[PDB]
Design an enzyme around this catalytic site. Structure first.
Site, short mmCIF file in Angstrom:
data_model
loop_
_atom_site.label_atom_id
_atom_site.label_comp_id
_atom_site.label_asym_id
_atom_site.label_seq_id
_atom_site.Cartn_x
_atom_site.Cartn_y
_atom_site.Cartn_z
N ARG A 30 0.43 8.63 0.99
CA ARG A 30 -0.36 8.94 2.24
C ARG A 30 -0.26 8.21 3.33
O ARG A 30 0.00 8.23 4.47
CB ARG A 30 -2.31 8.59 2.51
CG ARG A 30 -2.23 7.02 1.71
CD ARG A 30 -3.41 6.71 1.59
NE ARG A 30 -3.37 4.94 0.93
CZ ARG A 30 -3.72 4.89 -0.79
NH1 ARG A 30 -3.93 5.57 -1.62
NH2 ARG A 30 -3.15 3.92 -0.81
N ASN A 31 0.72 7.31 3.03
CA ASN A 31 1.14 5.81 3.36
C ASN A 31 2.77 6.83 3.76
O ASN A 31 3.90 5.83 4.16
CB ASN A 31 1.96 4.47 3.71
CG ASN A 31 0.06 4.21 3.79
OD1 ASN A 31 -0.45 4.60 5.27
ND2 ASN A 31 -0.51 2.93 3.17
N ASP B 297 2.81 2.19 7.58
CA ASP B 297 1.63 1.53 7.43
C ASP B 297 0.77 2.45 8.51
O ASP B 297 0.38 2.13 9.62
CB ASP B 297 1.52 0.15 7.51
CG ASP B 297 -0.21 0.20 6.73
OD1 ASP B 297 -1.03 0.35 5.70
OD2 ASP B 297 -1.09 -0.53 7.94
N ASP C 225 0.94 -1.00 -0.17
CA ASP C 225 0.33 0.19 -0.27
C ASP C 225 1.38 1.16 0.14
O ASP C 225 0.18 1.89 0.45
CB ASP C 225 -0.63 0.01 1.04
CG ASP C 225 -2.02 0.92 0.45
OD1 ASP C 225 -2.83 1.16 2.01
OD2 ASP C 225 -2.28 1.69 -0.30
#
Length: 331
Positions: free
Chosen positions: A192-193, A206, A188
């Site tokens: 945003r991470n 994460d 992911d």
């Protein structure tokens, strides 16, 4: 009556060459060194950084974590108060994975844990500037015009410029090279991470536990789950396989987010049946306006339809090192 969805460890460790192919290590089988244990009575919770469907991440002060006479701001991951022991075992598995990976400047590192005598807590480094996506969006206007007065985020009132984006590209490539070197896949990777801390150091993490995924339109419904389809390699979307090479695809999408000053990818293109189709047929995003041609070249190779033709993160690091070096007295 029955089990609701559970938090799971995002990052996976895989078993050393299945045959140029991949299988996950069950993280429960990893060891946990109890040297990480920190007494929970020496933790003082502050503000909730985000709350998702399974838990939250909170700012906290840990007293005597490293030096006995020194307090330290940390981030603390926790499930909902009601979480049962098997739900909480996911946090134990996360702790094992972080422990196994070891320390790198460009990841959010493990600092400690409270797993005895109460709720399961994972203590990590605190990144004071928050996630890079939000940072890029708030600082966007300062990039477009340097005379504008940049968004003040904690003690950071500086503008964003091209050298920042180059540095972030490099740092994230280094952190991902580190993960891949430990046979770890993120699955992911996205702005945003990636979090931002003192010195505008980027730390891959994460942060999904702090996020309500059902309320994030960057995650789309596919096969019973909600997935970051715009960041995913064609082969992950269609075969449900995550690999070192699909992390590279995502990193290419991240570079697009970066040089677009935090735009959501494939802007105005919903994830629908024709989106899937045009991705497999070879559609790719155009360059961001502010991407050096050389960086867009990297993006294009990260998005090669053939996973084996994509660069490794080791190669990306070498490529960006050459760009930064060649960009001196040229910014």
């Amino acid at each position: 009556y029955l089990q609701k969805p559970m938090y799971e460890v995002q990052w996976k460790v895989v078993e050393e060459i299945n045959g140029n192919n991949y299988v996950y290590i069950d993280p429960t089988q990893l060891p946990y060194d109890h040297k990480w244990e920190f007494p929970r009575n020496r933790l003082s919770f502050g503000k909730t950084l985000g709350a998702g469907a399974f838990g939250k991440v909170v700012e906290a002060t840990a007293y005597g974590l490293i030096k006995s006479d020194a307090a330290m701001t940390v981030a603390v991951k926790m499930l909902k108060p009601s979480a049962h022991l098997t739900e909480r075992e996911a946090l134990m598995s996360e702790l094992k994975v972080l422990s196994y990976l070891g320390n790198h400047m460009n990841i959010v590192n493990l600092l400690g844990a409270c797993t005895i005598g109460g709720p399961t807590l994972v203590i990590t480094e605190y990144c004071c500037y928050g996630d890079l996506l939000n940072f890029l969006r708030r600082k966007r206007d300062s990039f477009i015009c340097s005379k504008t007065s940049p968004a003040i985020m904690e003690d950071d009132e500086l503008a964003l410029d091209l050298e920042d984006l180059l540095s972030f590209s490099y740092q994230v490539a280094k952190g991902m090279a580190f993960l891949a070197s430990k046979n770890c896949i993120h699955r992911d990777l996205a702005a945003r991470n990636i979090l931002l801390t003192h010195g505008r150091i980027t730390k891959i993490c994460d942060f999904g536990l702090a996020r309500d995924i059902k309320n994030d339109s960057n995650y789309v419904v596919k096969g019973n789950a909600r997935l970051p389809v715009k960041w995913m390699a064609p082969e992950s979307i269609f075969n449900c396989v995550y690999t070192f090479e699909s992390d590279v695809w995502s990193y290419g999408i991240f570079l697009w987010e970066l040089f677009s000053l935090g735009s959501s990818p494939y802007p105005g293109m919903p994830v629908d049946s024709k989106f899937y189709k045009m991705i497999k047929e070879g559609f790719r995003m155009l360059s961001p306006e502010h991407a050096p041609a050389e960086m867009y070249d990297i993006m294009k190779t990260c998005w090669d339809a053939d996973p084996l033709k994509r660069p490794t993160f080791k190669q990306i690091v070498q490529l960006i090192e050459k760009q930064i070096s060649e960009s001196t007295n040229h910014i």
